[PDB]
């Protein structure tokens, strides 16, 4: 409860760790931590009744987040870990269920079978891109196919529980916590042409309430890098 990192504080009260490994460190690479290990809090999204889902490409959402987004421009390479805290504050009169996965190397498919989706439609700067419950027509040229039951990757969406995940059930749970180590083939990769993680949130059981309650539920995502290092003289 009331953990602090640098000059930021959040308050919590279970934690699922990656693939059973804690994040850890390895010319000469330098290890900066005083400008990075702090809770970067993204803006909150609203879970309405006719909602479908959200996704964040993970070293893209923190590209304008202060002194972590400056090291991405100055330093050429680097590896990172993460620690994600997702929580939705709803009352005892609401009901629903959320699935919070963290997909490594989540290559997504275009709406057209002959092209590839453009850069602005995969990720935005610290703003969640959202799915839709219908099919995107093939008359469009470069857009991501965002049907929820396929999760954009051509896979069954029920089988997404093989990744490190945590269920948020509004009857008995309030928050989730994920710890993700560095998962890549090379020990240091470029942080602009590569998005090695993807945080997805998908509501299976949709939100329901009676007439009178608040017609939305805000969800708060807080990301904090852990054990980051770069390559530079």
């Amino acid at each position: 409860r009331s953990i602090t990192l640098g000059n930021s504080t959040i308050t919590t009260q279970n934690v699922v760790v990656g693939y059973g490994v804690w994040p850890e460190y390895l010319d000469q690479p330098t290890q900066p931590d005083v400008a990075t290990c702090r809770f970067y809090t993204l803006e909150s999204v609203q879970w309405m009744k006719n909602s479908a889902g959200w996704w964040w490409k993970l070293p893209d959402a923190l590209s304008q987040m202060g002194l972590f987004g400056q090291n991405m421009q100055y330093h050429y390479l680097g590896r990172t870990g993460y620690t994600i805290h997702v929580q939705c504050n709803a009352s005892k009169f609401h009901q629903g269920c959320l699935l919070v996965v963290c997909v490594p190397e989540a290559e997504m498919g275009c709406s057209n079978l002959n092209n590839t989706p453009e850069f602005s439609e995969l990720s935005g700067g610290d703003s969640a891109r959202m799915f839709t419950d219908t099919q995107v027509g093939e008359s469009n040229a470069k857009k991501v196919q965002t049907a929820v039951w396929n999760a954009g990757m051509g896979v069954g969406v029920g089988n997404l529980t093989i990744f490190p995940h945590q269920w948020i059930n509004l009857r008995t749970n309030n928050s989730a916590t994920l710890v993700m180590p560095y998962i890549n083939s090379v020990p240091m990769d470029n942080m602009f042409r590569h998005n090695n993680l993807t945080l997805m949130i998908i509501p299976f059981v949709p939100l329901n309430y009676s007439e009178g309650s608040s017609p939305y539920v805000p969800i708060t995502v807080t990301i904090a890098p852990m054990c980051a290092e770069y390559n530079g003289l």
Partner: protein
């Protein structure tokens, strides 16, 4: 019976991945196959269960010939001989049958005549990284402009095949079936199996289909 579900028992198999023909008299008849894993749709689905693989490689070629219709006058030919050149990633590439890139020193080739055992050769795990990647969420590395999701760091090379005997009396065309076999497989970070049908060889594009087959009632 727990040993049959291991990674070595699941992946160390053989599969016909390529099948192409070439004749000798057409002055441009040779073969080409860029080595990848996304050729057949039955092995691509099994290697897509994991994200990072690392294996040695073992290839065997089954070459058979067939006499094309010649003109006349009692064709009688000796045994045929073939050359199977392997180009490493970042090497010269031939464009004609008579070219400098065949007679180079770096590209290791095999030579094989008919009526013998098939010509097996084995390629070790060659790359710059530490593992292969069936999936890549990003743009191409080391380039001015990059197509989405290519990952040129995994590149196993190319194969080229041609006849090395010139005979004018009889034209002979020949087929080749390349057999593919991983060895000493290590796999990391599993991944759920593909549901939708494959459409193209380059990308993971698809068309949205339902989850499973339907029934008439829940009970």
């Amino acid at each position: 019976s727990r040993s049959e579900s291991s990674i070595e028992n699941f992946l160390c198999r053989s599969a016909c991945v390529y099948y192409a023909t070439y004749t000798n008299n057409s002055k441009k008849g040779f073969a080409e196959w860029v080595i990848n894993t996304r050729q057949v749709a039955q092995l691509r689905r099994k290697l897509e269960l994991f994200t990072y693989l690392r294996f040695d490689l073992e290839l065997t070629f089954v070459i058979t010939s067939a006499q094309q219709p010649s003109t006349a006058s009692s064709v009688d030919a000796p045994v045929q001989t073939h050359q199977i050149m392997y180009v490493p990633p970042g090497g010269p590439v031939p464009t004609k049958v008579k070219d400098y890139a065949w007679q180079t020193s770096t590209n290791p080739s095999v030579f094989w005549t008919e009526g013998n055992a098939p010509p097996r050769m084995s390629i070790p795990f060659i790359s710059i990284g530490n593992a292969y990647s069936c999936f890549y969420d990003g743009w191409t590395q080391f380039s001015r402009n990059g197509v989405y999701g290519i990952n040129t760091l995994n590149n196993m090379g190319t194969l080229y095949m041609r006849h090395v005997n010139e005979a004018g009396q009889g034209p002979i065309k020949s087929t080749v079936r390349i057999y593919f076999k991983p060895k000493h497989v290590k796999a990391w970070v599993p991944r759920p199996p593909r549901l939708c049908q494959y459409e193209k060889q380059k990308n993971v594009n698809f068309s949205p289909i339902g989850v499973t087959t339907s029934r008439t009632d829940i009970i």
